[PDB]
Amino acid sequence: EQRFNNFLKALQEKVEIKQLNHFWEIVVQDGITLITKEEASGSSVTAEEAKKF
């Protein structure tokens, strides 16, 4: 859970800089579901609320 969670955070941060003809804007509007890492609690929910927007 935690290793893939921080990996997901790293890769979503990385994809959040490629400004192309199509990019993570679709992933932005994909915020209808879990788009931020969550391991058990604590830093998980805090990072979720921080990266919700």
Long-range contacts of 4-8, Cβ-Cβ distance < 8 Å, separation of 24 or more = 5/37, 5/38, 5/39, 5/44, 6/37, 8/37
Residue from 5, 4, 16 nearest 41 by CA: 5
Would you give the DSSP letter of residue 42?
T
Collect all residues with Cβ–Cβ distance below 8 Å to 38 and sequence separation of at least 6: 5, 44, 45, 47, 48
In the chain, which ranges are continuous DSSP H helix? 2-15, 25-29, 43-50
Q: What is the resolution of this structure in A?
A: 4.2
- C-alpha of 20 from chain center: 19
CB atoms within 10 A of CB 24: 17
